[PDB]
Amino acid sequence: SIGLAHNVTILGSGETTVVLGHGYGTDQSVWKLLVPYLVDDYKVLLYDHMGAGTTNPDYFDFDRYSSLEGYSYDLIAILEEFQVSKCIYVGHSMSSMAAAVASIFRPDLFHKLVMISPTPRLINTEEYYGGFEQKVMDETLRSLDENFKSLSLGTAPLLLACDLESAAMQEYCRTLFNMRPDIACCITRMICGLDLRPYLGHVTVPCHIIQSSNDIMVPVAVGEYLRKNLGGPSVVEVMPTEGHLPHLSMPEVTIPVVLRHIRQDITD
């Protein structure tokens, strides 16, 4: 079944359902400091994206997940299986962009998207600053297969903006390295090459854009770019946090921001 394949967990109760989608390198346990604040007021659905170390490697389809919509279709199938409709989807990074694409295919399934550290494209063009030059991304992936561990460990403190003794860093590394390496390399190459800019105009569900003020993967101006190009309402809140996973590394600041955007719909 879909539920067992994605380790679907349902908690709480209520009229409205909140769906929590972890990002790259983590699993649904990343939400553990947020869920207790939701369960009395909402039904909460948690799931692992295919390829997370907690999922069966034999279910990972290398063709399916070399494009982001493999993840979008899985999400739709999950929401259909549990007859969830008009949900409040909270996602980190790629997960929030997969939900955005899913919301083009199936707007009925989403009341709004709460997006932690989203970007539609990492790589610079002449008129778009995504944060990375084409050839520096090419180098960072040159022999990605042979250097995965080395590159991941050496970049993780910069990506998360916390150090190797930090509780957040040790938790991230645990789940990151439970992925099968060829799986992680496939997902990584897919994320780094994404260009969702052509689809933003087709998103119509309200989007809440939450970002760190210093994120090596997400220039602050990318939040504004999203706000300008999304097809429906949106709002941007830049937090006084650093790092690409502020919900994991700086929950004391971040969890109250996420809760406010879950609870409060966008105004005029």
Automatic annotation (TrEMBL):
Positions with a binding annotation for Mg(2+): N229
InterPro entries registered for this protein in UniProt: AB_hydrolase_1, AB_hydrolase_fold
AB hydrolase-1 domain span: 18-254
Record keywords, A-Z: Hydrolase, Metal-binding
GO molecular function: hydrolase activity; metal ion binding
One family name in Pfam for this protein: Abhydrolase_6
In-chain residues carrying the UniProt-annotated modification Cysteine sulfinic acid (-SO2H): S93
Entry's family note: Belongs to the AB hydrolase superfamily.
Identification of the protein by name: Hyposensitive to light 7
Organism, scientific name: Striga hermonthica (Purple witchweed)
